[PDB]
DNA sequence: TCAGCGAGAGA
RNA sequence: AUCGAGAGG
DNA sequence: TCTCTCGCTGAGCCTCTCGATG
């Protein structure tokens, strides 16, 4: 949620 | 006047080619007076005139004799800007390793060799790196590949 | 009413309805008490200096049979007072003198008596002293030491909530924190095994430490077991030491040694030394008295005193408590609870730095005594003062908590001394700090202000003390409450701390009590254990003392603050500390009642010590003749007060005092004799009263802009004075020294005219920017000291310092030793009054008095004539002071008190302003649109009431023009003071003389002051009653007319009075421009300061914007021709001069520097031309 | 010269870290030189060798092996590797950004008389910014014969140099920039007008793109020097060029605040106002009647209006008729460009209506009419906001009469469930939810009553009879027009403050039953500080995350440029509407 | 380190490289300029 | 301090 | 010319 | 193959003021 969510998508973070 | 930038490793001959002065044994600029001491870090002879078109001894001061080194003191007459251009070198007495190629997660000074990082460090720490130097010299790359 | 002489001249009307049971305490206690506990003589060894001396002594040589002992210490008397130190530029301190005794015992017999002993007194450095206002003078500058809030020593039980070990389990842990020593904590792991960390090192298994205390596995099982289960008991211990290496005790000891110090061969004679020098020693470990108390309280122990070291039993109880918490029968404590954080002040910080340097000399003494001497040695020869004095001096002058003092107005000056910081040695860090430490905790109630905090990266880490808060013996903040017994609220006051307060239920201060004291309603709102709810009256135990118990000093000065939003309250409280004092102080028309307390406790005014009558009054001196009841058998009875005149502060503002008493008047003790900056008849006065209207005017107040009338500018309501200091040092340098003569090469005759014969500007000379103040020639070259730029004021002060190795010039006679002449004249004038009084008293013996006075004069002359130690390499210093005036202009920042701020857009002619039906124009027009989005409604209520205070002042004023009789004035003022619903203030004019009534009326003809305390203020109905008494509409809105056309506005507009402030953000200090100038030395790019005449920075984001535009040529200009390219800028300047707008760029120098550095690192890099 | 020694006020010189590490390496290496001749035992020889190693590891990257060397102070020395990396290295501090010439800085103020392409510049700054041009023009006309003479003449300012300054800047643009600089609209170009004083005057319509307000903001100014730079500034960066967003397709210039309120008041309608029932010849008669004093702006009348429309190919064709309207609408019709229908102003004009007008004018007629229309709209709004005398007072905030009922009955219900807790009938974790629901319902009731009373507060006698109409209360009009103030803020001002939250995040059971008109007591005010502090802390610490993400995004895509017209591929993406749950979140029109 | 041990070569094709060296960027009013350069070889 | 992701461990 | 302390948007 | 210690990497932008130590 919020900024961490988009920073996690754009960094290709593994779930 | 150029189109590309090239980067590669340096060699002792290239380093000596870059240089204007020999091994610098003295330690200090010279604290007592403005004139720096010779052969040290700051030096009039190695890196050029401290002041424009004037030699250190002061025997030549003006243009038409430019490009002629003085006889008594051996000082070239040139604009002082050269003092931010020229370099020098220190000739050591014992070989030393480069920390960048050794200190890394993929350590590349021991990547070619099979020795682990800990063992290579222990040999280098002696608890000077002639072992590493000779081991890298003796290795034949083509047969290994 | 009012009873004192000072306050009866202007009585403020109060709307408060709750009686005050407790007074407001002295606001500077926290510093004075702390320093007194440090410098005083303690008969016991409880506190700072004596306790420090009783810890490094006695010291004796190892079997040398020689020892030195401490007996007593004395502080000396300062060579100079505060003012002399400030003028000179030195530290204000007293010398420490200690008498010591040295004994040497008989050889081969330790119990044998000492053959001979020696006694002597020694000097051990200089200790800086606090002033009466709580500051220090270090090098002529006043500084503040800030209090620190830190976690208390003891033992704490923490955990984690889903941080690591994503399996979904909690990892409890415990930690022990001492006062001076190493750390020790116990932690769990996902495998439910016990581990121990020492000094935050690698997690070694727990049971090994038990093996270091000579215990066996059966003994461990007996201790931790009586058997396993799922809830009641866990096998944690057994499963832990079944997976633990090593055994016995020596193996554990050597494992600890290996884990602590890497490498080295583990011996035996030097193996247990580490374990001993660990937590079981005294010289290297101390869990102190507060630490001991908290440790015992955490373990549920019935003892408070104890040892300052740990023991095996304590470690066992810690482990058992942690295991019990793991077993579901424990509890975790809150780390932000104010029962776990304590306060440390300047007195406690000074004793720690006096012990660090005291051990340094202790080691040297032992070595010297080891050599031995046959009574030739003396105590003085074995003592050195360098290290301890160095430590003390470094702390007083270089610590992070020793800060340059904020001196804008008195309120900021008093706010700086009540700050609490969570930073510094042993404290937090801005980056490390998260979100929970920055919050408002429910235990902050009554102890720290939840409103006042900075807005930058320090938010939540800087706090302010509340009005009634106090520290206890151990150092925890506490708050006062009223005892309730049998249902009646009494007058007994008890101070409770955060730990104990949670036990009882406490009623809110806005309750209704009967005449006896009983609660009126059947239910009372109360707090308990961090919650709030309704309870019965029989359950109540305590009650608050006041409705201003929650806020700090700055917040309690905001009227109608309960109608405002907390963000704007924060902004207003922070902005009140930036106001600049004006030419004429002006009291507020609307206030709260805290102004007198702040103005008096600040210490900027002059307060009478004893009563009497005024004998001589003047613009520089006041003389009081003491009443008979306050005399002494052998003293004259004269009090002399000298005032400060036009002195610069830390922020380059003006400090000036003026008297407010007349010849022949009587004064009681504690009365205001003179006002300092921003004070009006003993009340704090920051801004000015302005008549304002709320309406939009042609887009000139579009978004936070302010339109101002030219009448305001003409009357100097916001003009300020600024003082600046400049210096000129003469240094001995090779190849010729500098010149102080008036002669200057290439200098016109007119230039030397302004200066004297010695080249020094006269007193009172008017100068502008770029004008020579001192003639300086460098051997020559022109190095004269001049005004840099912009500043154009008057020379008002010249000072000269010289060394005892050089001669003196003409100005060194007419201005240097003439200052000494003026000081001697002042001293003689001061002494002459008392001398004449004594002579006249004794003329109705004299040789003794004459000799004593001659000795005093000689001592004063000797003190004045003493030289000063200057810096090496210099001989004489010349200091010059300049004063300038500043008037408001478009671009200046102004603010109110509710977070409403703006910038001035336009100065309007007076015929253009809106005016009322009587032709009266307004002063200020503000935008109404800025009111409703923010929720600072309190600025509207202030306006309406501000109108009601003016109308009353009108009716009195008219009665003083059409000269009336005193009874009508008496009746009208009596009706004015009696208006209210049910107020606690009563004023009776029948007990006044006619002259007193006339004076009071004369002080009320510009408006009647009103006081509206926070949470206890005036209601709308009372404001409307006051308005109706003043013959004004009860809506606050009237009809206006446009001054440009004479036409009437369509709707009625709100018009009133409001208090406004001028801040220290002046457009004169911020405007700057450059075309060419100087460049840095390595990277030949322009410099970066206005003081250095620097250029603006064009950063990466601006480059990104230009790239998104596509303007390549503008970017290339920005990177080459206006920057570190050297030939391009020269050619470009010549081309622009010649009229050809064309550039040919080259390569920047920064790229060459980067290439040279890369080559220096041993790497080949090249520009491939081919 | 790249590692120099800087003199000081005293005899001593400041020294660099590099000259210390170099000297240390030199001495440690030269100590082995003499030892070689002496033939020392190998025990001493080996240990010194290692001491050499670390010494070199000092000149190179320091701190990579622990125990970093330090100097006189207690801080590690900076090596050669420290001069190339980090925020203070060469790359991020001297090559991607730098300090420039011909620049300046000052505080900004509003200028309400300017045109959209102009800005106000102080003359003291300008005389110093444009120095070489003045020197050149002074040399051109013979007023000086040397550079020194021209410099002295400029310093001792005369009247002749001010005409020179007037002619130098006649058609020369300048660039203005505000520091945070988030998108490309943070730098723009303007024509300078010389003013008196020290502050910079800025156009009201460019503020929202700059994110600027007049409470202390500052700004920087730069001067182009070449013909190419001047032409790029005029053609690409001029403010009249930027009216549409690059992020979406929405206009970036938009009136707000006083303009919106003035236009909204100007176009409102009343009942039985003065002058009602007249028939007029056109807008000029309406203006004459209003300025005379014979009619009100809010009177309902009949006016004869003519309008132009596109016929078939962009040719304006006229039509004339009678229309029922008001005086103010007919007066405002005189600034609308030819080609737009009359229905676009025959109503109350809010913020969105004004934006729609601007967009329609841009679509139908183009760019040049649009800027003139915008400037005229700003002038009219500022002119007519002042004439109303709009203000705010304490009696504007009206509190509903039934509030004291709604709360009280609520306090009954919460009591009743407490009785249900005396004898076990409901779970102890259930009364929490029921009490919260009761309080939410009560707050909704109070808010609805407040708004219902405030929106129709005016009752009017038409002619011997009563009727209801939209009210003229100041707060209500400020909220309705869209100038300032959301509905929740009016709720807080004159309704109920509502339910707060604990610092952990739980809901405190008892709400604040007071508003900002009838003030709060100590407990409620203390409760309301947690939310304020949490908001301020959240704002203060999450700017760096956004900045870091922006820098990463800029670094990953800095090299993508349009290089061709058609690649020839045939693949692509199928577009479908976004429907989740049952409500279409995104249609199938804007995506394609 | 990787660049030095690999012997890499930089061709100055992006925006940042030309910004660092001080040439016209290959976009906007500079784009045609660069298109001329490749036409000269 | 606090995440994040290798790198080097082993049962 | 770094190091600490504060301030403004 | 699948957990578990062990570590260097990174952390928004632009202005202003003071002192102490080079
Ligand atoms: C503190 N701070 C501030 C800013 C800039 O400051 C602007 C608002 O600052 P402000 O004084 O005008 O207040 P604001 O307009 O928001 O509210 P009010 O006018 O009081 O109603 C904001 O856009 C922001 O870019 C920043 N970039 N970093 C910071 O760390
Ligand atoms: Mg602003
Ligand atoms: Zn020579």
CATH number at residue C790: 2.40.50.150
C–D interface: beta-carbon pairs under 8 A: 409
| Letter string b/e over residues C629-643, b meaning 16 or more CB atoms within 10 A of that residue's CB | eeeeeeebbebebeb
CATH code of the domain in which C862 resides: 6.10.140.1670
CB contact under 8 A, B87 and C1162: no
Q: Within this chain, do residues C932 and C1010 fall inside the same structural domain, yes or no?
A: yes
Indicate the helix (H) or strand (E) that contains C602.
helix C595-602
- CA separation for the pair C303, C296 (Å, rounded): 7
Q: DSSP code of B133?
A: H
C and B in touch (3+ CB pairs within 8 angstroms): yes
Q: Within this chain, do residues C504 and C426 fall inside the same structural domain, yes or no?
A: no
Give me the domain span that covers residue D497: 394-535
> Which nucleotides of strand H lie within 7 A of protein CB?
4-6, 10-22
Cα C691 to chain centroid, rounded: 34
Residue with CA at minimum distance from ligand 1 atom 22: D211
CB contact residues (below 8 A), chain C span 222-251, against chain E: none
In total, chain C counts a number of residues equal to 1170
Q: Is C968 exposed, middle or buried (0-12, 13-18, 19+ CB in 10 A)?
A: exposed
Q: Is C447 helix (H, G, I), strand (E, B) or coil?
A: coil
CB D84 within 8 A of CB D60: no
Strands (E), C182-223: 184-187, 195-198, 204-205
Kindly state the tokens that stand for C471.
């520290």
Identify which of D178, D180, D532 to mutate to test ligand 1's pocket (most ligand atoms within 8 A of the CB).
D180
Contacts of E25 in chain C (CB under 8 A): 1107, 1112, 1115
Q: How many other β-carbons are positioned within 10 Å of the β-carbon of residue C996? A: 13
Q: Within this chain, do residues C1144 and C1058 fall inside the same structural domain, yes or no?
A: no
Contacts of C935 in chain D (CB under 8 A): 489, 492-493, 516
Q: Is residue C1078 part of a domain?
A: no
Per DSSP, chain C holds a count of helices (H) and strands (E) of: 29, 54
Q: Within this chain, do residues C1008 and C960 fall inside the same structural domain, yes or no?
A: yes
Contacts of C1167 in chain B (CB under 8 A): 2, 4-5
Q: Is residue C968 part of a domain?
A: yes
CB C1156 within 8 A of CB D2: yes
CB C768 within 8 A of CB C781: no
C347 prior amide bond cis, ω within 30: no
Q: Is D563 exposed, middle or buried (0-12, 13-18, 19+ CB in 10 A)?
A: exposed
Q: Which residues are registered as beta bridge partners of D43?
A: none
- CA separation for the pair D281, D269 (Å, rounded): 20
Contacts of B101 in chain E (CB under 8 A): 1, 5
What interhelical angle do C312-324 and C217-224 show, nearest 10?
50
Q: Within this chain, do residues C177 and C207 fall inside the same structural domain, yes or no?
A: yes
CB contact residues (below 8 A), chain C span 645-704, against chain D: 693-700, 702-704
Main-chain dihedrals φ then ψ at residue D214, nearest 5 degrees:
-95, 70
CB C609 within 8 A of CB C601: no
In total, chain B counts a number of residues equal to 145
Task: Scan residues 1063-1092 of chain C and list those with Cβ within 7 Å of strand H.
Answer: 1072, 1088-1091
Interchain CB contact of E40 with D (< 8 Å): no
Q: How many other β-carbons are positioned within 10 Å of the β-carbon of residue C942? A: 25
Half-sphere exposure at residue C574, Cβ-oriented, CA atoms within 13 angstroms:
18
Q: Within this chain, do residues C133 and C193 fall inside the same structural domain, yes or no?
A: no
Contacts of B5 in chain E (CB under 8 A): 9-10, 12
Q: Within this chain, do residues C594 and C727 fall inside the same structural domain, yes or no?
A: no
CB C888 within 8 A of CB C714: no
Question: What residue of A is the nearest CA neighbor of D544?
Answer: A3
Q: Within this chain, do residues C636 and C692 fall inside the same structural domain, yes or no?
A: no
Indicate the helix (H) or strand (E) that contains D106.
strand D103-110
Q: DSSP code of C816?
A: I
CA distance C131 to chain D (A): 32
Cα dist. C59→C701, D73, D415 in Å?
A: 76, 33, 74
Of D386, D203, B36, D245, the C-alpha closest to C696 is D386
| Letter string b/e over residues C660-683, b meaning 16 or more CB atoms within 10 A of that residue's CB | bbeeeeebeeebbbbbbbbbbbbb
Q: Within this chain, do residues C374 and C255 fall inside the same structural domain, yes or no?
A: no
D214's CB contacts (< 8 A; 6+ apart) are: C702, C703, C704, C705, C902, C903, C905, D108, D109, D110
Q: Is residue C115 part of a domain?
A: yes
Place of tokens 């040892």: C307
Closest-lying ligand 1 atom to the alpha carbon of residue D217: 12
Nucleotide F6: nearest residue by CA–C1'?
B105
- Bridge pairing between strands C531-536 and C523-528: antiparallel
Q: Is C257 helix (H, G, I), strand (E, B) or coil?
A: helix
CATH code of the domain in which C643 resides: 2.40.50.100
Q: How many other β-carbons are positioned within 10 Å of the β-carbon of residue C602? A: 22
Contacts of B108 in chain E (CB under 8 A): 1, 5
Please state the three-class secondary structure of C354-365 as a single string.
HHHHHHHHHHHH
Q: DSSP code of E29?
A: G
Domain count, chain C: 8
CA of D130 relative to ligand 2 center, distance in Å? 28
- CA separation for the pair C412, C554 (Å, rounded): 9
Resolution reached, in Å? 2.7
> Which nucleotides of strand G lie within 7 A of protein CB?
1, 3-9
CB contact under 8 A, E12 and B3: yes
Of C764, C818, C798, the C-alpha closest to C876 is C798
Residue with CA at minimum distance from ligand 1 atom 13: D215
Per DSSP, chain A holds a count of helices (H) and strands (E) of: 1, 0
**C400 nearest nucleotide via C1' and CA:** G4
- CA separation for the pair C627, D43 (Å, rounded): 91
CB D347 within 8 A of CB D333: no
Nearest to E19 among D96, D228, D232 (CB): D96
Cα D162 to chain centroid, rounded: 36
Q: Is residue C21 part of a domain?
A: no
Of C479, C445, C684, C507, the C-alpha closest to C588 is C684
Q: Is residue C17 part of a domain?
A: no
Place of tokens 């009497």: C612
Query: Which spans in D423-494 are helix H?
Result: 431-455, 474-480, 487-494
Residue D180 near ligand 1, beta carbon < 6 Å: yes
CB contact under 8 A, B7 and C1160: no
Closest-lying ligand 1 atom to the alpha carbon of residue C899: 20
Half-sphere exposure at residue D215, Cβ-oriented, CA atoms within 13 angstroms:
11
CB C1128 within 8 A of CB C1143: yes
Last residue of a domain, one of C465, C499, C521: C465
The Cα angle at residue C830 between residues C824 and C835, in degrees rounded to 5: 110
CB C1009 within 8 A of CB C10: yes
Q: Within this chain, do residues C392 and C492 fall inside the same structural domain, yes or no?
A: no
Q: Which residues are registered as beta bridge partners of C173?
A: C158, C187
Of D16, D24, D93, the C-alpha closest to D58 is D24
Residue D181 near ligand 1, beta carbon < 6 Å: no
Question: What residue of E is the nearest CA neighbor of D91?
Answer: E20
Last residue of a domain, one of C629, C651, C678: C678
D401's CB contacts (< 8 A; 6+ apart) are: none
Q: How many other β-carbons are positioned within 10 Å of the β-carbon of residue D64? A: 15
C1094 Cβ nearer than 7 Å to chain H strand? yes
Q: DSSP code of C918?
A: T
D99 Cβ nearer than 7 Å to chain H strand? yes
Longest dimension (CA), chain B: 64
* Subunit partners of chain A (3 or more CB pairs within 8 A): D
> Which nucleotides of strand F lie within 7 A of protein CB?
1-9
Of C698, C592, C606, the C-alpha closest to C1015 is C592
The Cα angle at residue C778 between residues C777 and C779, in degrees rounded to 5: 115
- CA separation for the pair D332, D287 (Å, rounded): 9
CATH code of the domain in which D478 resides: 1.10.132.30
C432 Cβ nearer than 7 Å to chain F strand? yes
Interchain CB contact of D112 with C (< 8 Å): yes
E and D in touch (3+ CB pairs within 8 angstroms): yes
Q: Is D329 exposed, middle or buried (0-12, 13-18, 19+ CB in 10 A)?
A: buried
CB B46 within 8 A of CB B29: no
Method: cryo-EM
C168 Cβ nearer than 7 Å to chain H strand? no
Q: Is A2 exposed, middle or buried (0-12, 13-18, 19+ CB in 10 A)?
A: exposed
Cα dist. C873→C729, C784, C807, C878 in Å?
A: 10, 20, 16, 15
Interchain CB contact of B25 with D (< 8 Å): yes
Sign for the pseudo-dihedral over CA of C868, C869, C873, C877: negative
- CA separation for the pair B49, B79 (Å, rounded): 7
Kindly state the tokens that stand for C981.
């619903």
CATH code of the domain in which C489 resides: 2.30.150.10
Q: Within this chain, do residues C418 and C472 fall inside the same structural domain, yes or no?
A: no
Query: Which spans in C179-226 are helix H?
Result: 207-211, 217-224
CB contact under 8 A, D232 and E16: no
- CA separation for the pair C261, D452 (Å, rounded): 78
Q: How many other β-carbons are positioned within 10 Å of the β-carbon of residue C856? A: 13
Interchain CB contact of C1113 with E (< 8 Å): yes
Give me the domain span that covers residue C124: 26-152+335-465
Residue D539 near ligand 1, beta carbon < 6 Å: no
Indicate the helix (H) or strand (E) that contains D262.
helix D258-266
Q: Is residue C1075 part of a domain?
A: no
Identify which of C704, C899, C939 to mutate to test ligand 1's pocket (most ligand atoms within 8 A of the CB).
C704
- CA separation for the pair C816, C820 (Å, rounded): 7
**CA-to-C1' span, C978 to H20 (A):** 61
Task: Scan residues 187-246 of chain C and list those with Cβ within 7 Å of strand H.
Answer: 189-191, 202-203
What interhelical angle do D529-541 and C566-575 show, nearest 10?
70
Cα C1068 to chain centroid, rounded: 28
- CA separation for the pair C1104, C1098 (Å, rounded): 11
C617's CB contacts (< 8 A; 6+ apart) are: C623, C659, C661, C662, C663
Indicate the helix (H) or strand (E) that contains C833.
helix C817-842
CB B102 within 8 A of CB E5: no
Q: Within this chain, do residues C280 and C385 fall inside the same structural domain, yes or no?
A: no
Kindly state the tokens that stand for D585.
């979140």
């Amino acid at each position: 949620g919020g900024l961490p969510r988009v920073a996690d998508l754009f960094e290709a973070r593994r779930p | 006047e150029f189109d590309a930038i090239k980067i590669a490793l340096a060699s002792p001959d290239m380093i000596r080619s870059w240089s204007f002065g020999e091994v610098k044994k003295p330690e200090t600029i010279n604290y007592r007076t403005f004139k720096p001491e010779r052969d040290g870090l700051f030096c009039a002879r190695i890196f050029g005139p401290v002041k424009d078109y004037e030699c250190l001894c002061g025997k030549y001061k003006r243009l038409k004799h430019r490009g002629v080194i003085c006889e008594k003191c051996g000082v070239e007459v040139t604009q002082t800007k050269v003092r931010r251009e020229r370099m020098g070198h220190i000739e050591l007495a014992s070989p030393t390793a480069h920390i960048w190629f050794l200190k890394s997660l993929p350590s590349r000074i021991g990547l070619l060799l099979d020795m682990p990082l800990r063992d290579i460090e222990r040999v280098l720490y002696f608890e000077g790196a002639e072992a590493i130097q000779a081991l890298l010299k003796s290795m034949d790359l083509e047969q290994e590949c | 009413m009012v009873y004192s002489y000072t306050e009866k001249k202007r009585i403020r009307k109060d709307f408060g309805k709750r009686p005050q049971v407790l007074d407001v305490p002295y606001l500077l206690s926290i510093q004075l008490d702390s320093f007194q506990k440090f410098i005083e003589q303690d008969p016991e060894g409880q506190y700072g200096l004596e306790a420090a001396f009783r810890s490094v002594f006695p010291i004796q040589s190892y079997s040398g049979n020689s020892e030195l002992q401490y007996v007593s210490y004395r502080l000396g008397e300062p060579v100079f007072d505060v003012q002399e130190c400030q003028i000179r530029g030195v530290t204000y301190s007293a010398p420490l003198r200690v008498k010591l005794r040295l004994v040497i015992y008989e050889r081969e017999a330790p119990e044998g008596t000492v053959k001979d002993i020696k006694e002597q007194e020694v000097y051990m450095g200089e200790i800086p002293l606090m002033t009466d206002n709580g500051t220090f003078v270090i090098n002529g500058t006043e500084r503040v030491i800030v209090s620190q809030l830190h976690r208390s020593p003891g033992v704490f039980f923490d955990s984690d909530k889903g941080k690591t070990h994503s399996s979904g389990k909690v990892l409890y842990n415990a930690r022990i924190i001492p006062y001076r020593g190493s750390w020790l904590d116990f932690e769990f792991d996902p495998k439910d095994n016990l581990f121990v960390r020492i000094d935050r090192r690698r997690k070694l298994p727990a049971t090994i430490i038990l093996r270091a205390l000579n215990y066996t596995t059966e003994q461990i099982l007996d201790l931790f077991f009586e058997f396993t289960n799922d809830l009641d008991h866990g096998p944690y211990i057994s499963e832990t030491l079944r997976v633990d290496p090593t055994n016995d005790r020596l193996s554990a000891l050597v494992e600890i040694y290996r884990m602590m110090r890497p490498g080295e061969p583990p011996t035996r004679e030097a193996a247990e030394s580490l374990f001993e020098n660990l937590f079981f020693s005294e010289d290297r470990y101390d869990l102190s008295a507060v630490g001991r108390m908290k440790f015992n309280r955490s373990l549920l122990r019935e003892e408070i005193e104890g040892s300052g070291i740990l023991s095996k039993d304590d470690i066992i109880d810690v482990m058992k408590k942690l295991i019990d918490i793991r077993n579901g029968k424990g509890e975790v404590d809150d780390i932000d609870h104010l029962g776990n954080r304590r306060i440390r002040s300047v007195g406690e910080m000074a004793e720690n730095q006096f012990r660090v340097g005291l051990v340094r000399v202790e080691r040297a003494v032992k070595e010297r005594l080891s050599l031995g001497d046959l009574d030739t040695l003396m105590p003085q020869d074995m003592i050195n003062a360098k290290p301890i004095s160095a430590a003390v001096k470094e702390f007083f002058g270089s610590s992070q908590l020793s800060q340059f003092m904020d001196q804008n107005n008195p309120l900021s000056e008093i706010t700086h001394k009540r700050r609490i910081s969570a930073l510094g040695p042993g404290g937090l860090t801005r980056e490390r700090a998260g979100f929970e430490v920055r919050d408002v905790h429910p235990t902050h109630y009554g102890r720290v202000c939840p409103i006042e905090t900075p807005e930058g990266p320090n938010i939540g880490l800087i706090n302010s003390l509340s009005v009634y808060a106090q520290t206890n013996e151990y150092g925890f903040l506490e708050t006062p409450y009223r005892k309730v017994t049998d249902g009646v609220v009494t007058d007994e006051i008890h101070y409770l701390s955060a730990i104990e307060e949670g036990n009882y239920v406490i009623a809110q201060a806005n309750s209704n009590l009967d005449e006896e004291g009983h609660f009126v309603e059947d239910l009372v709102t109360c707090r308990s254990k961090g919650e709030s709810s309704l309870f019965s009256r029989d359950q109540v135990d305590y009650m608050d003392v006041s409705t201003q118990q929650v806020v700090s000093v700055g917040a309690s000065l905001i009227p109608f603050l309960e109608h405002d939003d907390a963000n704007r309250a924060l902004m207003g409280a922070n902005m009140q500390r930036q106001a600049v004092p004006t030419l004429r102080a002006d009291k507020p028309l609307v206030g709260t009642g805290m102004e007198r307390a702040v103005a008096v406790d600040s210490g900027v005014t002059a307060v009478a010590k004893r009563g009497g009558v005024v004998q001589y009054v003047d613009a520089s001196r006041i003389v009081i003749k003491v009443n008979e009841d306050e005399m002494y058998p052998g003293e004259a009875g004269i009090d002399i007060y000298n005032l400060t005149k036009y002195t610069r502060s830390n922020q380059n503002t003006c400090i000036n005092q003026m008297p407010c008493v007349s010849l022949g008047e009587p004064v009681e003790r504690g009365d205001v004799l003179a006002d300092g900056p921003s004070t009006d008849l003993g009340e704090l006065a920051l801004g000015q009263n302005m008549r304002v209207a709320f309406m939009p005017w042609n887009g000139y107040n579009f978004e936070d802009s302010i339109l101002v009338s030219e009448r305001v500018v003409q009357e100097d309501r916001f003009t300020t004075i600024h003082i600046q200091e400049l210096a000129c040092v003469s240094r001995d340098t090779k190849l010729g020294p500098e010149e102080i003569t008036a002669d200057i090469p290439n200098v016109g005759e007119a230039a030397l005219s302004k200066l004297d014969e010695s080249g020094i500007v006269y007193i009172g000379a008017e100068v502008t920017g770029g004008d020579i103040l001192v003639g300086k020639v460098t051997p020559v070259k022109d190095s004269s000291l001049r005004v840099p730029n912009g500043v154009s004021g008057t020379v008002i002060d010249v000072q000269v310092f010289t060394r005892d190795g050089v001669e003196k010039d003409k100005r060194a006679l007419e201005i240097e030793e003439m200052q000494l002449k003026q000081a001697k004249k002042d001293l003689s004038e001061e002494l002459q009054i008392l001398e004449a009084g004594l002579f006249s008293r004794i003329r109705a013996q004299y040789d003794e008095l004459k000799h004593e006075f001659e000795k005093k004069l000689e001592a004063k002359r000797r003190k004045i004539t003493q030289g000063d130690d200057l810096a090496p390499g210099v001989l004489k210093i010349v200091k010059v002071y300049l004063a300038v005036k500043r008037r408001i202009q478009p671009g200046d920042k102004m603010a109110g008190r509710h977070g409403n701020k703006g910038v001035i857009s336009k100065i309007n002619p007076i015929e253009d302003m809106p005016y009322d039906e009587n032709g009266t124009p307004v002063d200020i027009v503000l935008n109404p649109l800025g009111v409703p989005s923010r929720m600072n409604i309190g600025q509207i209520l202030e306006t309406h009431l501000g109108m009601a205070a003016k109308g009353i002042g009108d009716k009195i004023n008219a009665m003083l023009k059409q000269q009336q009789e005193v009874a009508k004035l008496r009746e009208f003022i009596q009706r004015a003071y009696d208006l209210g619903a049910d107020v606690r203030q009563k004023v009776d004019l029948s007990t006044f003389s006619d002259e007193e009534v006339m004076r009071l009326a004369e002080n009320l003809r510009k408006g009647m002051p009103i006081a509206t305390p926070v949470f206890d203020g005036a209601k709308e109905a009372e404001i409307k009653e006051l308005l109706k008494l003043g013959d004004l509409p009860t809506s606050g809105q009237i009809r206006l007319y446009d001054g440009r056309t004479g036409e009437q506005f369509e709707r009625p507009v709100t018009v009133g009075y409001m208090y406004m402030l001028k801040l220290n953000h002046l457009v004169d200090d911020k405007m700057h421009a450059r075309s060419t100038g100087s460049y840095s030395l390595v990277t030949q790019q322009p410099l970066g300061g206005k003081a250095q005449f620097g250029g603006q920075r064009f950063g990466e984001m601006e480059v990104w914007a230009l790239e998104a535009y596509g303007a390549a040529y503008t970017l290339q200009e920005m990177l080459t021709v206006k920057s570190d390219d050297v030939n391009g800028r020269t050619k470009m300047y010549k081309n622009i001069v010649d009229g050809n707008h064309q550039m040919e760029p080259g390569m920047p120098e920064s790229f060459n520097v980067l290439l040279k550095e890369i080559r220096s690192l041993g790497i080949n890099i090249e520009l491939e031309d081919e | 010269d790249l590692r120099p020694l800087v003199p000081l006020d005293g005899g001593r010189f400041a020294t660099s870290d590099l000259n210390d590490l170099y000297r240390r390496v030199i001495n440690r290496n030269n100590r082995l030189k003499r030892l070689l001749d002496l033939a020392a035992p190998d025990i001493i020889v080996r240990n010194e060798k290692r001491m050499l190693q670390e010494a070199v590891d000092a000149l190179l990257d320091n701190g990579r092996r622990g125990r970093a060397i330090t100097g006189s102070n207690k801080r590690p020395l900076k090596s050669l590797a420290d001069m190339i990396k980090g925020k203070q290295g060469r790359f991020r501090q001297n090559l991607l950004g730098k300090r420039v010439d011909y620049s300046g800085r000052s505080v900004i103020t509003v200028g309400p008389y300017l045109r959209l392409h102009q800005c106000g510049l102080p003359k003291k700054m300008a005389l110093e910014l444009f120095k070489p041009f003045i020197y050149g023009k002074l040399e051109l006309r013979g007023l000086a014969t040397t550079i020194k003479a021209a410099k002295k003449m400029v310093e001792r300012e005369e009247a002749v140099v001010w005409d020179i300054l007037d002619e130098v800047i006649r058609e020369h643009p300048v660039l203005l920039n505000r520091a945070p600089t988030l998108h490309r609209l943070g730098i723009q170009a303007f024509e300078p007008v010389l003013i008196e004083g020290k502050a910079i005057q800025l156009h009201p319509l460019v503020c929202a793109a700059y994110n600027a307000d007049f409470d202390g903001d500052q700004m920087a100014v730069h001067v182009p020097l070449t013909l190419e730079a001047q032409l790029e500034a005029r053609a690409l960066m001029m403010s009249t060029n930027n009216i549409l967003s690059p992020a979406n397709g929405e206009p970036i210039i938009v009136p707000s605040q006083d303009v919106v309120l003035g236009l909204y008041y100007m176009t409102r309608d009343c009942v039985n106002a003065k002058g009602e029932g007249m028939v007029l010849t056109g807008p000029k008669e309406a203006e004459r009647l209003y300025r005379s004093g014979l009619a009100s702006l809010h009177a309902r009348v009949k006016v004869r209006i003519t309008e132009y429309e596109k016929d078939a190919n962009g040719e304006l064709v006229a039509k004339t008729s009678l229309k029922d309207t008001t005086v103010g609408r007919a007066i405002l019709w005189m600034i609308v460009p030819k080609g737009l229908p009359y229905s676009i102003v025959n109503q109350a004009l809010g913020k969105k209506a004004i934006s729609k007008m601007l967009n329609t004018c841009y679509r139908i007629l183009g760019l040049k009419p649009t800027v003139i229309f915008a400037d005229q709209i700003m002038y009219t709004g500022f002119a007519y906001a002042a004439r109303s005398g709009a203000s705010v007072g304490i009696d504007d905030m009206v509190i509903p009469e039934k509030k004291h009922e709604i709360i009280s009955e609520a306090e009954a219900e919460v009591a009743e469930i407490q009785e249900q807790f005396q004898s076990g009938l409901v779970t102890a974790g259930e009364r929490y939810n029921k009490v919260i629901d009761i309080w939410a319902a009560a707050n909704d009731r109070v808010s609805k009553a407040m708004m219902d009373n405030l929106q129709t507060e005016t009752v009017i006698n038409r002619d011997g009879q009563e009727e209801k109409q939209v009210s003229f209360n100041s707060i209500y009009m400020m909220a309705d027009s869209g100038a300032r103030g959301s509905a929740a803020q009016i709720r807080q001002l004159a309704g109920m403050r509502g339910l707060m939250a604990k610092p952990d995040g739980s809901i405190i059971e008892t709400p604040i039953t007071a508003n900002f008109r009838e003030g709060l007591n100590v407990l409620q005010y203390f409760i309301s500080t947690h939310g304020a502090r949490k908001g301020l802390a959240d704002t203060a610490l999450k700017t760096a995350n956004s900045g870091y993400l922006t820098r990463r995004l800029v670094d990953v895509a800095q090299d993508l440029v349009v290089t061709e017209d058609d690649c020839g591929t045939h693949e692509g993406i199928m577009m479908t509407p976004v429907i989740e749950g049952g409500d279409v979140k995104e249609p199938l029109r804007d995506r394609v | 380190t990787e660049a030095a041990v690999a012997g890499k070569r930089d061709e100055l094709r992006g925006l940042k490289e030309n910004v660092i060296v001080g040439r016209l960027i290959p976009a906007g009013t500079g784009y045609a300029y660069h298109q001329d350069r490749m036409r000269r070889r």
